[PDB]
């Protein structure tokens, strides 16, 4: 009932990040400056987790399947590379026991119901 995540699950996520060479500090460095950017980056991570083939490629390569992400997201490879560690983290969250953080990320990315930056 309670909306808490377990430290053991948080750090289990971290153990996965350690396999990629990512810390929680790396994530802060890769944090997008504004809303447009972060909705976009978390959305990339979302579709990367939404697809099993992409997620499995991500795990085995320890890097994002950049070409496959680029064809589905229609983003720049430069976007992918700059936010790579960050995108990996959220992707992992959507498929990891971090259901509350999943919920935070999912509700934030669905907020593109009106999204024109002008």
């Amino acid at each position: 009932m309670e909306d808490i995540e377990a430290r053991e699950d948080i750090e289990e996520l971290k153990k996965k990040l350690q396999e990629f060479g990512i810390t929680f500090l790396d994530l802060v460095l890769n944090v997008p400056k504004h809303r447009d950017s972060r909705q976009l980056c978390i959305r990339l991570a979302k579709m990367l987790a939404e697809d099993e083939q992409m997620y499995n490629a991500l795990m085995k390569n320890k890097n994002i399947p950049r070409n496959e992400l680029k064809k589905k997201a229609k983003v720049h490879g430069r976007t992918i590379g700059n936010n790579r560690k960050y995108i990996i983290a959220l992707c992992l969250i959507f498929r990891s026991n971090l259901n509350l953080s999943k919920r935070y990320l999912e509700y934030y990315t669905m907020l593109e119901h009106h999204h024109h930056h002008h």
Partner: protein, 53 residues
């Protein structure tokens, strides 16, 4: 004067890496109510800077 709600992902000494309500992993000022895995409602002014260049 601006609240951000988030989830605590790591305690790092006197600071903590938390998620914000925008999914940002940001370092804020460590508090009493902090435990890795719990939620925290903090100020945007608790947020540190990594400083980027």
């Amino acid at each position: 004067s601006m609240n951000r709600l988030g989830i605590i992902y790591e305690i790092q000494g006197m600071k903590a890496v938390v998620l914000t309500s925008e999914g940002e992993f940001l370092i804020i000022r460590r508090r009493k109510d902090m435990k890795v895995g719990q939620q925290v409602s903090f100020e945007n002014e608790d947020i540190y800077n990594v400083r980027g260049k």
